[PDB]
């Protein structure tokens, strides 16, 4: 349950905003490819919960299959790629018919949370996944960087599940929390936000207000 509808935007590099007091803050720059049109609302009557379903990245019709574009043309909106809802408490007033919601709702709310696919690092070891220590690099040692002991002795007879092994590190989404908003641009369709979003410039990014 979220405390309100959010938007989604793409990361476009990082820079530094110079505050007129004299400080230098590192900000991430957020663009918006297409407006976050509310496509499908799911209320308490026809569904077990209440959520507002928006989308993103208007595309060519060849890029989008028949169930997708049939679902989007059921709402009478543009064919678009990305599609996510926000679960919201039952006080909502949202029509699914082409609500091109403008981005003014976050500037006075100087706290926002963001979610995104972090950059994947592939099958990485235990020295960087779970912040282990390496063995002795010298003094006749042989267990350089290795995983060390894995379990206890005879009495378990196995290893505990969830034990810290090497595996695929990045690729899942994360949410970093309470990130204070900064100078929006009402003509450059760009929002400064002081922090570090998950991922390189180009990826999708959930931008939804806080849950404290």
């Amino acid at each position: 349950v979220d405390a309100g509808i959010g938007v989604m935007g793409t990361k476009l590099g990082m820079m530094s905003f110079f505050e007129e007091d004299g400080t230098v803050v590192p900000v991430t720059v957020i663009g918006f490819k297409e407006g976050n049109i509310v496509t499908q609302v799911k209320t308490e009557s026809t569904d077990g919960y209440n959520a507002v379903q928006v989308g993103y990245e208007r595309l060519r019709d060849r890029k989008l299959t028949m169930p997708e574009r049939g679902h989007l043309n059921k709402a009478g909106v543009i064919p678009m790629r990305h599609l996510q809802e926000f679960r919201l408490v039952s006080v909502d007033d949202f029509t699914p018919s082409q609500k091109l919601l403008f981005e003014e709702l976050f500037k006075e709310g100087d706290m926002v949370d963001i979610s995104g696919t972090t950059i994947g690092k592939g099958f990485q070891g235990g020295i960087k996944r779970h912040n282990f220590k390496r063995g002795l690099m010298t003094h006749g040692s042989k267990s350089h960087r290795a995983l060390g002991s894995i379990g206890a002795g005879t009495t378990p007879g196995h290893v505990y599940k969830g034990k810290k092994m090497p595996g695929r590190m990045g690729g899942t989404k994360t949410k970093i929390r309470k990130l204070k908003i900064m100078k929006i641009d009402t003509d450059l369709r760009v929002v400064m936000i002081k922090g570090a979003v998950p991922g390189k410039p180009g990826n999708l990014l959930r931008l939804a207000p806080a849950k404290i």
């Binding site: 950059i119 690092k121 592939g122 390189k200």
Partner: protein, 116 residues
């Protein structure tokens, strides 16, 4: 991880890879059409586009860098007398990567380089 490392390294070390690039683009400029593997094909594509457009502006500095890159002496001087008369107005894209059957003994994906 290889995020954004856009060098195309082969199954050979660095200086041997440089010699493979120079020799194979040299004999590519000698015969025109050539049989490579596909990694060697794209690795020829970047450098031989650099060597067609290098002696496109036939000065002395371009001719000396171009003679420094290519092995054979008499093929650089057969190049700038040929590339403005042929590959003017093309503005990039000097090759073609026509693929063929894999190689007997390796199942190596084998390609074939033109000049067009």
């Amino acid at each position: 991880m290889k995020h954004g490392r856009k060098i195309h390294r082969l199954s050979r070390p660095a200086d041997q890879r440089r010699a493979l690039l120079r020799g194979l683009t040299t004999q590519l400029l000698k015969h025109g059409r050539i049989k490579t593997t596909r990694a060697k094909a794209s690795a020829m594509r970047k450098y031989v586009d650099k060597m067609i457009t290098l002696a496109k502006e036939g000065s002395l500095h371009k001719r000396r860098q171009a003679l420094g890159f290519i092995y054979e002496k008499q093929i650089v001087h057969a190049l700038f007398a040929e590339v403005p008369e042929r590959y003017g107005d093309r503005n990039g894209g000097y090759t073609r990567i026509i693929r063929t059957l894999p190689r007997r003994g390796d199942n190596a994906p084998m390609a074939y380089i033109e000049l067009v």
